[PDB]
Design a protein around this ligand. Sequence first.
Ligand SMILES: CN(C)c1cc(-c2ccncc2)c(Cl)nn1
Length: 276
Amino acid sequence: TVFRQENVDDYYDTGEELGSGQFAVVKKCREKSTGLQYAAKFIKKRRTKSSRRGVSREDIEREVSILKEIQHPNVITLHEVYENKTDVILILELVAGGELFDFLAEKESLTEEEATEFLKQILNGVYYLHSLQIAHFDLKPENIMLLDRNVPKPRIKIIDFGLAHKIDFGNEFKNIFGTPEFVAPEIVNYEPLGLEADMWSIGVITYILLSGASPFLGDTKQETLANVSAVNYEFEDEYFSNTSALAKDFIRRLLVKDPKKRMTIQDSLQHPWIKP
Ligand SMILES: CN(C)c1cc(-c2ccncc2)c(Cl)nn1
C-alpha cells in the first residue's frame, strides 16, 4: 500500500517531542486546515532489502492495517499516514497526559481502587482488540497514555501497535519479542504466540501498579528472561502485606506459564476483583 507523499510540513506544523525510540520519534503537531492537534510518529524505513536499521515495509504496513481498523475509547486512533524516502509518518490522536509509567513514578504505588480504575480501562481496550483477534504484544506502562493526568480518575488509551498482529489461526509463529520484564514465557521460549501473551503482560502491569516493583526483573536482560521462563516471582510481604487476597488471586491466574491455563480477557473481566 502507498501513502500520501506530499510534504507533511505543507499540512502540519510540528512542536515539542513526545517520545523518542529506537526507530521512531514522536512530535506534537497541528493540522493547518483544522487547527486540530495530533501526535506525528516518524518511523525510519529500511534503506536496503536486508538492512538491520529501520523498520521493514512489511512491518509498517501491518501496523497501519491494524491501526486503520480500530476505534475504541481506550485505544489510540489513526488520523492519516504520510511517507517519504526516509520515513513513514503516522498522524495519531494526541494523548497529552503522559505515560502511565510517569504517573506511577509520581505516586510510588497505587491503592487497589486506583489500580482497578486504570486496569478496567486497560481490560476494556484489550477486550476490544482480542475481539478483533488482535494481539498487542507490547503491553507495558510506557504504552499506556492518560488523556489528562490531573483528574482523580484519568482516562487511558493503549498506544504503540508496532508489534501487534492479527491472530487468524489461534497462534502466530514469527520474530516477535518485546521488553523482557513484560513478555510471556512463550515469547522467551520462541513458542507459537496468541492472545494469551497479552494476558500475562496485564498480570505484570497489575503487580507493578499495586507494589511499585517489577516481578521478574533481574540485573541483566538475560536474567529477567530466565526468571520469566521459570515463573520466578513472589508477593513480597513488604509490598503486599495490606493488598487483598483477591488482588493477588487475579495476578496469580495471569502469571501462569501454560497459556492454555491462563485467564482469558473475558475471564479477567468476570474475575471477582474486577466484576463490580
Ligand atoms: C511515549 N511513547 C513511547 C510514545 C508516545 C506516543 C504518543 C504520545 C502522545 N500522544 C499520542 C501518542 C506514541 Cl505515538 N508513540 N510512543
